């Protein structure tokens, strides 16, 4: 019967309404309830035929299902919108978000739930606001749609409409007597969303409706966000609000210059110099009652500059690009603070620009400052540590020395972030457990890249001791990936993913240096994964025994010398010699096998399947366990 359901779903999705009616013709009531109620999966999309018919705009199919077959409008399922799939969307929601006005009218006129709540609390009105269809918004609100219904994160239709470029939708919402002071979960009161994308007309409309200015959660005014996003025109409009005072004007102009100093889309150093000059002149306008800048002490990351407390020194750095970049970064740090989310991005961008200009030391200083600031705020830095590994790899591939204190600092930060990643993974059950586990594995890979790069750099005894202390700290928490891989195993395994960028040149796995360092730092060499393979079991499965034979020989010597059993068995009860799959590895391991009577006895007991429980020492019960 499910084949008929698939036929019905395909006919409804493909627009063949006549074939759909022919298939649904002369059927019983239970048959048509099952056919129209079946939720088939065309991949990851769980949807009834009515939902997909409303999604793709088949208004004839919707009309046939509603007027004649009396199908319900409250069917729910998962839909593929913007590439990703989220549950909780009705057919009315799909018709609203896909711009199908005729299907919206057909569903509403037949009694669809206009105020249906998604699992993310997304109303079809919010869907039409996101799509920007003003006519659909008018029809929905005129059919008793509640504007005040926000999402899970308290993002109303007004907030997203302000964020989006559809000024007609937000202007209609505010003309319909909406809430001007709509607080969000993050504290953005519907003015930051408009003054983040540079929509001057939407900000004008809200100021006409007197949306009022209030500090958000991050300690920023909407003017502050407008200055951060380099959008100068909304900064001007917010300065012309007639209730701003002077100090806000100086700090807003300075922040605008700082944002223009380092950004991807907006990068014009002449704008930075002119805006900072205007800020300094406005600051030193009264002559008396001079508003001297309070300056944070100089930070080694941005060189050693101490801002520009005078217009003369600001003039002196007019022609120097990097001095102006450092000045913009410093004033941005002073204004937005060290705890702001957006303060880190220009630092990383300036570091990347320095890296492209083959200036690595200042790049490392800037990125270390950015990593410290982001770790103080306790956010995801796996991409950042990957960037550190990539730039270290490019330095090594270019035969440029890497500073040992920087390696120690980034390694300690990676260890700490792996610890909080473990805490997050333990805390998060199933909300974003896939993303959390992917971050965990990525962090482990980045740490191994950093260790491999540290092996290729000569370091002082103190710095080498600190690096080894950090590696020791990471081992004594025993990180594990999805398939039980201990941190030793990933350095052992050839299947460890390597980033496609310059990290292929330097960090190639397996790497004997990494294994020697990890065993010297106290790695548990007898640790086994979920599948039961030890480090030795993985290393004998290496498929390139001769191209890097020195690497294989050194790692097998290190593994045997650490104390790994050359006789233990995985979950499938296979000797590493039996899993050698290579004559070279078999010869090497037989050369390094140190046979003992205990090993032979335990192997014979396991092969004979004698009941060993409660007849042997408990410590030897483990020995029977792996032998």
């Amino acid at each position: 019967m499910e084949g008929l359901a698939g036929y019905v779903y395909k006919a409804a999705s493909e627009g063949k309404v006549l074939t759909l009616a022919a298939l649904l013709l002369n059927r019983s009531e239970s048959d048509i309830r099952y056919l129209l109620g079946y939720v088939s999966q065309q991949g990851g999309q769980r949807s009834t035929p009515l939902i997909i018919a409303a999604r793709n705009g088949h208004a004839k199919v919707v009309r046939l299902l509603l007027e004649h077959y009396r199908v319900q409008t409250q069917q729910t399922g998962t839909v593929r919108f913007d590439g990703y799939v989220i549950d909780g969307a009705t057919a009315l929601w799909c018709a609203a978000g896909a711009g199908h006005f005729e299907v919206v009218k057909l569903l509403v006129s037949h009694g669809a739930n206009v105020n249906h709540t998604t699992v993310t609390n997304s109303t079809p009105l919010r869907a039409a606001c996101f799509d920007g269809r003003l006519d659909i918004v008018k029809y929905l609100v005129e059919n008793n749609a509640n504007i005040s219904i926000a999402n899970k994160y308290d993002n109303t239709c007004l907030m997203i409409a302000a964020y989006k470029g559809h000024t007609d939708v937000v202007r209609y919402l505010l003309e319909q007597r909406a809430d001007p002071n709509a607080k969000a979960h993050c504290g953005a009161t519907a003015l930051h969303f408009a003054a983040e994308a540079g929509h001057i007309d939407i900000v004008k409309e809200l100021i006409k409706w007197r949306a009022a200015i209030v500090v958000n959660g991050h300690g920023m005014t909407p003017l502050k966000v407008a200055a951060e996003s380099c959008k100068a025109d909304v900064v001007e409009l917010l300065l012309s609000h007639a209730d701003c005072d002077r100090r806000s004007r100086i700090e807003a102009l300075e922040l605008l210059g700082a944002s223009f100093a380092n950004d991807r889309e907006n990068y014009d150093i002449i704008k930075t110099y002119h805006y900072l000059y205007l800020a300094m002149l406005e600051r030193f306008q009264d002559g008396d009652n001079i508003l001297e800048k309070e300056v944070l002490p100089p930070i080694h990351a941005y060189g050693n500059r101490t801002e520009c407390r005078n217009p003369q020194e600001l003039e002196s750095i007019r022609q120097d690009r990097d001095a102006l970049h450092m000045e913009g970064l410093i004033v941005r740090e002073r204004i937005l603070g060290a705890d702001n989310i957006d303060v880190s991005h220009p630092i990383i961008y300036r570091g990347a620009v320095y890296a492209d200009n083959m200036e690595f030391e200042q790049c490392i200083k800037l990125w270390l400052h950015a990593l410290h600031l982001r770790q103080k705020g306790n956010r995801n830095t796996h991409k950042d540590l990957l960037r550190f590994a990539q730039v270290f790899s490019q330095m090594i591939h270019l035969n440029e020395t890497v500073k040992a204190p920087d390696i120690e600092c980034v390694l300690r930060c990676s260890v700490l972030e792996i610890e909080q990643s473990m805490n997050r993974v333990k805390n998060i059950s199933d909300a974003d457990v896939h993303n959390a586990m992917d971050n965990y594995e990525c962090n482990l890979y980045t740490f191994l890249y950093l260790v491999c790069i540290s092996t290729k750099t000569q370091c002082s005894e103190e710095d080498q001791c600190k690096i080894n202390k950090q590696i020791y700290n990471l081992i004594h928490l025993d990180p594990r990936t999805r398939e039980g891989f201990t941190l030793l195993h990933l350095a052992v395994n050839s299947n460890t993913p390597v980033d496609d960028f310059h990290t292929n040149d330097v960090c190639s796995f397996p790497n004997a240096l990494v294994t020697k360092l990890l065993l010297d730092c106290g790695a548990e060499v007898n640790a086994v994964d979920n599948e039961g393979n030890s480090a030795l079991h993985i290393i004998v499965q290496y498929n390139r025994p001769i191209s890097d034979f020195l690497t294989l020989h050194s790692i097998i010597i290190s593994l045997v010398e650490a104390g790994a059993h050359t006789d233990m068995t995985n979950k499938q009860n296979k000797t590493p010699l039996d899993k050698s799959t290579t004559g070279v590895s078999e010869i090497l391991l037989k050369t390094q096998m140190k046979m003992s009577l205990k090993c032979l006895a335990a192997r014979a007991v396991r092969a004979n399947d004698i009941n060993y429980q409660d007849q042997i020492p408990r410590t030897l019960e483990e020995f029977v366990g792996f032998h």
């Binding site: 989220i86 978000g97 993050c186 983040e196 991005h345």
Partner: peptide, 21 residues
């Protein structure tokens, strides 16, 4: 690829911007 950080959108993805927010 290079070194260019794709975090300018991440600084703007902290606001609830999505199909639902």
């Amino acid at each position: 690829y290079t070194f260019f950080p794709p975090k300018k959108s991440h600084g703007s993805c902290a606001p609830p911007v999505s199909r639902a927010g």
